[PDB]
Design a protein around this ligand. Sequence first.
Ligand SMILES: CCCCCCCCCCCCCCCC(=O)O
Ligand SMILES: CCCCCCCCCCCCCCCC(=O)O
Ligand SMILES: CCCCCCCCCCCCCCCC(=O)O
Ligand SMILES: CCCCCCCCCCCCCCCC(=O)O
Ligand SMILES: CCCCCCCCCCCCCCCC(=O)O
Ligand SMILES: CCCCCCCCCCCCCCCC(=O)O
Ligand SMILES: CC(C)[C@H](N)C(=O)O
Ligand SMILES: [Cl-]
Ligand SMILES: [Ru+3]
Length: 581
Amino acid sequence: HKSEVAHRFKDLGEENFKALVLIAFAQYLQQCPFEDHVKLVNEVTEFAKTCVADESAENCDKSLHTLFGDKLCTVATLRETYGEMADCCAKQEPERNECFLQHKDDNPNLPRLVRPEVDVMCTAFHDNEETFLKKYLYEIARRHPYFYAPELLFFAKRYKAAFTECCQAADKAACLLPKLDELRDEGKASSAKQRLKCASLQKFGERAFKAWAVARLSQRFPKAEFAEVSKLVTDLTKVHTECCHGDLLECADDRADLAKYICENQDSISSKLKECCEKPLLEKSHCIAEVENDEMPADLPSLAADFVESKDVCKNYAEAKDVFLGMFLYEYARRHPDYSVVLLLRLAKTYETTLEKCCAAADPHECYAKVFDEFKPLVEEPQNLIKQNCELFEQLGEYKFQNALLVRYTKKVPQVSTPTLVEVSRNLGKVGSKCCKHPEAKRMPCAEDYLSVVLNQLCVLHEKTPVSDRVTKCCTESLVNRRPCFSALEVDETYVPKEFNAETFTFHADICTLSEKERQIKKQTALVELVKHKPKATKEQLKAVMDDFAAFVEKCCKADDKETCFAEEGKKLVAASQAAL
Ligand SMILES: CCCCCCCCCCCCCCCC(=O)O
Ligand SMILES: CCCCCCCCCCCCCCCC(=O)O
Ligand SMILES: CCCCCCCCCCCCCCCC(=O)O
Ligand SMILES: CCCCCCCCCCCCCCCC(=O)O
Ligand SMILES: CCCCCCCCCCCCCCCC(=O)O
Ligand SMILES: CCCCCCCCCCCCCCCC(=O)O
Ligand SMILES: CC(C)[C@H](N)C(=O)O
Ligand SMILES: [Cl-]
Ligand SMILES: [Ru+3]
């Protein structure tokens, strides 16, 4: 690699190269205009083609980090706009690159990206596809400077596909808007998972991340040997450590090296990687990360022969505790793709505790005899919660299931803001809509994937604006016991009911002109305030007020003088509700 810019240009291709260079510089110069970044991209791309033609050409021998930092230091207004970031230019490598890393500003002060009307977007898409798409790519990247650039490119290509299909359909909005919202949720969920793994790696440590990786990788590649899984776990931990640190190119090299090793050893890993390993380097690691679990060996025995019955259990444990516990996790996880990773970790921690007490006892076999009996209640707790909640989602609709969660969680923690209580309960209802359509065998991993992002969105907002010591405890405990903590939250008996406010329970004819979303949120906001004002109301008493409110809306939205109905039949509904409650 006399020329790494030329090797990357030949590997990625011109189109991918230009997009990734745009993202990389937009994530650093997050206050520079789009037209500046375009000239920078074209200047780097033309230089790269020079090196593709002749790798011996001037500056082609330099490292990509040196070329990136050099280009950053050619911006004429670097000190005017970014201040102390420009002082990184006085340093040399590798200190300059590290200096630029620290001054990457997460949460820039930028206005929220307003989604234009579908007709405006489709017209701009048609008349100027390149500038329309790349300007949007630039607005996303400058607002999310730590989002892994290739993954942002992967989302960006799905946005382009959505615009190509729906901008030609009959009802363009009916095609595009659900697709746009789906991509937005997918992007927020990806960013949430990434920042979760990084913060957990720092707070809880490397061993906890390794235990998580053993469980997930054993579920994914059950036909692999433990030595192969442990090798992948060690590599995956180094990958995430580097990627959490923030260097895009070092993170990309580590990821590609892992995907290369996996693709050269598919025979020892899994049988479902043939396609991902034929994909280009840009997409190889992404494909492997999302590939389905391999079918497990059907000839698998019980875990009793190696972990409770046989002698040399305490001896093998003391020889290498983490390795022995890892073997337990690998064997259990490969046999259980139906379990959440955190349940597998609860079972391994249960085994660890029991082995630590029993191996210090006179006849260890005696107290480590019935430890598989201790796994039953831990397995049943999430399974029961999923079965009952998926039954509730089938009885009611998604909306009325959201309203059930609304009353439940408002009663548990009534100090939370009404906007936050509404968004959380709405999201949790969508988790039921998607995971309860899975058979029981794939429901707990489904719930874990989505509950983790809802609970981190929750725990982030609480760190910034705290309201409950109980939520602080659940959010600061291990991620293994985060969901159980929230599940064990009980109805708050210290809550003082909020005082009545007539404006909160006064409704107008604008409710009939809103769309389903705005109407539902308006009603869901009032339901939270209803429970906050009358927290001792039963679900029967609440259903009576809700049913009355529903008839009040339907009648006054169909009346001739709609506004006075909402004012006169509204003051009747309020008074009768106050009497019943
Ligand atoms: C290889 C180059 C691919 C082309 C790049 C495509 C970039 C598309 C970005 C579209 C973002 C749309 C965001 C709309 C607002 C929202 O829903 O939050
Ligand atoms: C290839 C094995 C690497 C090392 C794996 C360590 C063995 C498992 C760790 C102890 C049991 C699980 C503990 C829960 C994790 C946590 O929340 O810290
Ligand atoms: C001034 C020139 C600097 C070049 C900066 C842009 C280079 C982007 C690096 C390409 C990403 C590597 C491919 C993805 C690999 C993976 O994630 O497995
Ligand atoms: C799939 C249904 C989700 C319904 C949303 C309401 C919350 C119910 C939680 C059900 C149990 C979740 C278990 C996740 C994995 C674990 O903690 O072991
Ligand atoms: C941002 C601060 C919010 C504080 C917490 C708000 C109260 C609602 C959260 C409860 C969700 C629990 C997740 C599923 C657990 C269960 O239902 O068993
Ligand atoms: C006791 C104070 C005044 C109460 C007045 C009625 C308040 C009702 C607010 C909640 C309405 C929820 C609607 C249920 C489902 C639906 O029909 O969309
Ligand atoms: C980063 C995420 C929040 C963003 N909405 C996306 O499109 O990728
Ligand atoms: Cl957004
Ligand atoms: Ru977003």
